[PDB]
Design an enzyme around this catalytic site. Structure first.
Site, short mmCIF file in Angstrom:
data_model
loop_
_atom_site.label_atom_id
_atom_site.label_comp_id
_atom_site.label_asym_id
_atom_site.label_seq_id
_atom_site.Cartn_x
_atom_site.Cartn_y
_atom_site.Cartn_z
CD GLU A 212 -2.80 1.16 2.65
OE1 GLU A 212 -2.73 0.42 3.33
OE2 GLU A 212 -3.41 2.07 2.53
CG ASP A 214 -1.85 4.84 2.84
OD1 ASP A 214 -2.51 4.47 2.05
OD2 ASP A 214 -1.19 4.10 3.64
CG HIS A 228 1.57 0.98 4.85
ND1 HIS A 228 1.27 0.73 6.10
CD2 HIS A 228 0.97 2.30 4.53
CE1 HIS A 228 0.70 1.94 6.65
NE2 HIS A 228 0.55 2.68 5.79
O1 LIG Z 1 -6.53 6.13 3.81
C1 LIG Z 1 -6.71 4.77 3.15
C2 LIG Z 1 -6.39 3.72 4.28
C3 LIG Z 1 -6.92 2.30 3.54
O2 LIG Z 1 -6.53 1.08 4.50
N1 LIG Z 1 -5.00 3.68 4.97
C4 LIG Z 1 -4.74 3.23 6.06
C5 LIG Z 1 -3.29 2.87 6.29
O3 LIG Z 1 -3.02 1.55 5.93
C6 LIG Z 1 -2.97 2.79 7.78
O4 LIG Z 1 -3.91 2.48 8.68
C7 LIG Z 1 -3.78 2.93 9.98
C8 LIG Z 1 -2.61 3.08 10.73
C9 LIG Z 1 -2.58 3.21 12.06
C10 LIG Z 1 -4.08 3.00 12.66
C11 LIG Z 1 -4.98 2.97 12.13
C12 LIG Z 1 -6.46 2.88 12.72
C13 LIG Z 1 -7.44 2.59 12.15
C14 LIG Z 1 -7.52 2.27 10.99
C15 LIG Z 1 -6.21 2.54 10.11
C16 LIG Z 1 -5.15 2.60 10.70
#
Ligand SMILES: OCC(CO)NC[C@H](O)COc1cccc2ccccc12
Ligand SMILES: *[C@@H]1O[C@H](CO)[C@@H](O)[C@H](O)[C@H]1NC(C)=O
Ligand SMILES: [Co+2]
Ligand SMILES: [Co+2]
Length: 434
Positions: A212, A214, A228
């Site tokens: 991933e 971001d 990630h």
């Molecule tokens: O914006 C797109 C999303 C798609 O999954 N990205 C998320 C990243 O993988 C990081 O995720 C997290 C990192 C730390 C705490 C978290 C607590 C709750 C949810 C996610 C968390």
């Protein structure tokens, strides 16, 4: 799952620019598709729901295989159900949309054709977009990111998925998400546990892992850039708590790094760089341009443009690291000063480079956070920590902020607009659009 056609599926069109080292850019025509989790899942031969609220039909879905055989995904009314609109090179995603039911947010993929995802090879290239975050308060995340999904949504590997990319199948990310209703052409009913705090979601016995990138996780208060890595680069099913990630008892047991090597300028000490109004370097009440460059070393560079003024990623000093490039030295110093070993356990930027060297799918989303209230992005986290704890403060939002039911009630007209995507060789995307 299969596809049904009780509701037609017309992907909102979206254009973007492909730029070249020779200094010109040409327009590409794509479209966007909503992820399968947001869709109505019903029996192939009737309107009977296979999933409703946060429970599956025990008769249609007694096990994962039978469920997928009996059930289909249907089409999406993008504007009136999901608050998703496009115009030319612009995409808008509303937060709460009231139709016959209440919908919250959306996760969308850029398509190459009406049945296939667009793939981007990030390494050696840069990705530019414009964003308006002005209507995103504390607790929301307007995200633009990449994941190592299959271009067909999984159909070639799992022929019991016949719906495919046209219906937004095949999602994965670094959280190894277990809230997905279908993974690998099978439902996720086995082991399903409804969410204690969300009437519409739960957690199943399987999750779906992949790398991933971001590029942008942000609201009007905070923004972060986070790679990630995963030990398997592309989409891979995981089993229960072995998944790790946010949806599992132990977040660090699995094949992906759910924390990432995050670069958040506020977290690193520059609390004046990004925020609402003229007291900040970048004024989040106005549209801004975000450029992200993936140099072949595997490091990541970043700059911004607002009102014709250019700003590199602000310099940070952390342990023995000093600079503004997200590189091995940065990520190592971050782990040393803020804590954790997930990023380096999973192979760091060297392993991450395996993802950016291959194809990744572009995702645009708007969401609120039923696990941690987005505090990890825009607040102090964990909330018992103070500013004396290195890296604890990631933004200025209250540790009470971002309760989903509250922000849904108070800020239903919140929205994010992504526009003017441009992609090509490093140095190329600032040249004139065709
Ligand atoms: O914006 C797109 C999303 C798609 O999954 N990205 C998320 C990243 O993988 C990081 O995720 C997290 C990192 C730390 C705490 C978290 C607590 C709750 C949810 C996610 C968390
Ligand atoms: C924050 O970053 C901006 C842009 O690099 C810089 O001009 C400003 O001086 C920085 N402020 C602090 C407190 O670091
Ligand atoms: Co299994
Ligand atoms: Co460099």
């Amino acid at each position: 799952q299969s596809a049904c056609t009780l509701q037609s599926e017309t992907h909102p069109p979206l254009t973007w620019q492909k730029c070249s080292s020779g200094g010109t850019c040409t327009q590409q025509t794509g479209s966007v598709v909503i992820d399968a989790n947001w869709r109505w899942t019903h029996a192939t031969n009737s309107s009977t729901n296979c999933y409703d609220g946060n429970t599956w039909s025990s008769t249609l879905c007694p096990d994962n295989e039978t469920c997928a055989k009996n059930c289909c995904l249907d089409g999406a009314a993008y504007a009136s159900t999901y608050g998703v609109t496009t115009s030319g090179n612009s995409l808008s995603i509303g937060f709460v949309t009231q139709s016959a039911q209440k919908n919250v947010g959306a996760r969308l993929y850029l398509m190459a054709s009406d049945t296939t995802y667009q793939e981007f090879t990030l390494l050696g290239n840069e990705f530019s977009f414009d964003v308006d975050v002005s209507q995103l308060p504390c607790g929301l995340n307007g995200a633009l990111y990449f994941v190592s999904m299959d271009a067909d949504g999984g159909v070639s590997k799992y022929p019991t998925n016949t719906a495919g990319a046209k219906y937004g199948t095949g999602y994965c990310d670094s959280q190894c998400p277990r809230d997905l209703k279908f993974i690998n052409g099978q439902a996720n009913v086995e082991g399903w546990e409804p969410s204690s705090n969300n009437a519409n979601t739960g957690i199943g016995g399987h999750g779906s892992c992949c790398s991933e990138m971001d590029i942008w996780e942000a609201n009007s208060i905070s923004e972060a850039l986070t790679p990630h890595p995963c030990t398997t680069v592309g989409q891979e099913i995981c089993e229960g708590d072995g998944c790790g990630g946010t949806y599992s008892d132990n977040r660090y047991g699995g094949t992906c790094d759910p924390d990432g090597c995050d670069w958040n300028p506020y977290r690193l000490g520059n609390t004046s760089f990004y925020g609402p109004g003229s007291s900040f370097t970048l004024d989040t009440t106005k549209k801004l341009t975000v450029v992200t460059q993936f140099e072949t070393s595997g490091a990541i560079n970043r700059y911004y443009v607002q009102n014709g003024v250019t700003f590199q990623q602000p310099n940070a000093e952390l342990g023995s690291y000093s600079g503004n490039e997200l590189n091995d030295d940065y990520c190592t110093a971050e782990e040393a000063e803020f804590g954790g070993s997930s990023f380096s356990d999973k192979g760091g930027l060297t392993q991450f480079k395996k993802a950016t060297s291959g194809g990744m799918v572009l995702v645009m989303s708007l969401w609120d956070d039923y696990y941690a209230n987005m505090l990890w992005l825009d607040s102090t986290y964990p909330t018992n920590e103070t500013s004396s704890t290195p890296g604890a403060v990631r933004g200025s939002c209250s540790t009470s902020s971002g309760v989903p039911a509250q922000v849904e009630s108070q800020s239903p007209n919140a929205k994010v607009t992504f526009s003017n995507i441009k992609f090509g060789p490093i140095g190329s995307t600032g040249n004139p659009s065709g």
